[PDB]
Design a protein around this ligand. Structure first.
Ligand SMILES: *Cc1c(COP(=O)(O)O)cnc(C)c1O
Ligand SMILES: *Cc1c(COP(=O)(O)O)cnc(C)c1O
Lengths: 387, 387
């Protein structure tokens, strides 16, 4: 196995800081390395494994579709695509009834930004500081992180950033020249920072009043992650374009921009496209993922375990803890010091995999099927490494 | 099946020109609609189905990996990723030894454009008129088709377009401020126009003289499509960044930017990324696709059947034919009038599925495993509809 680890490390582009291990298999919220060590996975593909590694229903759907048909373009109708379309719109508000399937979160946001420009005839985009929308140039234009943009300037213009949750700033930024406002209901990469009900309500109101579109990015908050199927359900608003990805296909690369009928209608024929977008394999996986989410009402699990887990983390008697925040099982543990060393020790000494969300934050994105006993071990492991 | 067909038509964003049938399954170069009618597929997912629909090896790899692990990020090594890296670089020139896996062709080119800017510290991109690089905003900036860009301006600047195969124009355009030149060895959507050896040699020579990178987009030409493993093998040049997708994963969404090590190391840690990029499912599919390609030296079927197929098409006794061009099984039949009506007749009257490559060109991208007898049936169908 060392040979394969070496091959990956040596031949990789090198932009990633790869950990010293080789993960070979996963089941539920657990994964094993090449040496047989078992880990509690709170990384879960960065929020992709919501339904658990190797979800039986998704695996079965993938196997059966793989034997049937994998390559069929959007110009040629295929049953699993129609099924995905009705299955996805069925779990959304009546207004979000037109689907543009893609292969990633950044592609979903790129689609949203393009549909917004075609519909409004405007150019300006308004995003939030610390907001993250993707790495391709369009999505990157509305992504805040300076280090993520600077090396690649100039990007798509014009874009204006406002402080997250700053209602007055948002009010002054949105005008008759604004094509769209793009926001995450809970900033992920930004440090696990939930939006206030007043901020999203204001975003919905101001966009409608000025003729701009509201794009809500639920690529990370969607699919039950925050305690509801979608975070917007918790805030009581319905966007003009909803972007989804990560857990949408239960692990299979899949994303989507779901929009209102009038928005979709404005797009010229042939105005946008994607080779893999809407492919039958991903459609079959998406249908299975959504059907599983619905049947199990898995979001209720995150709504219960989330608060419990966060309360346990807050109760850890460590003077190194600054705050525990988030929604459902989208959790952030902020320390009064650098988190990197503790994340490494969690992996190396406790076999608990976790992420970061800023230099002082430990982020947890465990599959929503994670057992309470495993979350207990995570709390104990965090306490141990902080001692 | 009617309900699923109508659900797809109605719930779709509407940007696609969807045909009036439902394709439910495929095997080899044949596909079936919901009524049991069998078609010869020269669309093949727009060049994705190179190894044939339901390729046994890819299907088995997909099924087995699906049961094992699907979601694992780039920060956590996983064996299939290392295997994909060494398997892919093993079939490429030694210079192309660093891989950045992605989920689509446009993502591959977005990565190429970003790595180019980071490496050179320059901004300008040079592309060819009629060139197609993708629909996300970065790739769209270097894509020519006005209908694809107009509703979304402004895009990423600065970009200068030159006529394809115009050596002198290329020499005038590439300068000390040029980060990269991006070209297809054979323009796909552009009308199936092969580059001349002179043009590509010039691109390679001028970019190195001026300090710019050469990005060769083989998303459509790669994986044996033109008679060789990769089209650049025909022209005797090696690019700085090679972009691949479509058939790379045998149908599973997969793309990649393969580059020289000096280019890869220039990218700052965290300077680029992707959630699904490099996932074990796509890596397993890619390994299997490449292994099958290598075992069967599949490009050889395209090398033998392509010239023959083009010769037969060219011999069709119709004054409506202007020229037949292409390389391997990437073929374009240019007519003196619109191709759309004939493509429709091919489908309805002969159960032959084909594409366009500009309004007057009928493009054929059949799986490379297609039977000679079926290509013969295609030639006869074209003759019939043109009569
Ligand atoms: C992960 C993420 C993205 C980017 O999605 P990719 O699939 O990595 O391109 C965009 N927005 C949010 C909120 C995300 O969490
Ligand atoms: C199909 C294609 C692309 C775009 O790839 P997607 O997977 O549709 O994003 C880019 N370049 C070329 C030459 C292509 O044929």
């Amino acid at each position: 196995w060392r040979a394969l680890l070496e091959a990956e490390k040596t031949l990789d582009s090198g932009v990633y800081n790869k950990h010293d291990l080789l993960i070979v298999r996963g089941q539920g919220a657990r994964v094993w390395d090449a040496e047989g060590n078992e880990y509690i996975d709170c990384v879960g593909g960065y929020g992709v494994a919501n339904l658990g590694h190797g979800n039986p229903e998704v695996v079965e759907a993938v196997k059966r579709q793989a034997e049937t048909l994998m390559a069929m373009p959007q110009t040629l109708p295929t049953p699993m695509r129609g099924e995905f379309y009705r299955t996805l719109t069925a779990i959304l508000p009546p207004e979000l009834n037109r689907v543009f399937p893609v292969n990633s979160g950044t592609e979903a946001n790129e689609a949203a930004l393009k549909f917004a420009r075609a519909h409004t005839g405007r150019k300006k985009f308004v995003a939030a500081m610390r907001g993250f929308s993707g790495r391709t140039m369009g999505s990157l234009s509305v992504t805040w992180e300076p280090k993520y943009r600077e090396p690649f300037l100039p990007l798509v213009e014009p874009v204006e950033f406002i402080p997250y949750n700053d209602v007055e700033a948002l009010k002054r930024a949105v005008d008759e020249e604004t094509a769209a406002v793009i926001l995450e209901p809970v900033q992920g990469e930004g440090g696990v920072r939930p939006a206030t009900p007043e901020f999203l309500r204001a975003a919905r109101e101001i966009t409608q009043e000025k003729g701009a579109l509201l794009i809500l990015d639920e690529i990370q908050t969607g699919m039950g992650r925050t305690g509801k199927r979608f975070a917007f359900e918790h805030f009581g608003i319905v966007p003009d374009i909803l972007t989804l990805a990560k857990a949408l296909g239960g692990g299979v690369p899949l994303g989507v921009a779901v929009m209102r009928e009038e928005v979709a209608r404005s797009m010229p024929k042939g105005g946008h496209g994607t080779t893999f977008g809407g492919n039958p394999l991903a459609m079959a996986a998406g249908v299975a993922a959504i059907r599983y989410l619905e049947r199990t009402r898995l979001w209720e699990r995150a709504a219960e375990l989330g608060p419990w887990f966060m309360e346990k983390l807050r109760a850890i008697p460590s003077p190194k803890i600054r705050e525990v925040r988030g929604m459902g099982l989208m959790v952030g543990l902020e320390l009064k010091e650098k988190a990197a060393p503790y994340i490494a020790r969690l992996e190396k000494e406790h076999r608990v995999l976790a992420l970061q969300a800023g230099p002082t934050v430990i982020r947890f994105l465990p599959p929503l099927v994670i057992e309470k006993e495993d979350l207990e071990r995570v709390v104990e492991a965090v306490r141990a490494v902080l001692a």
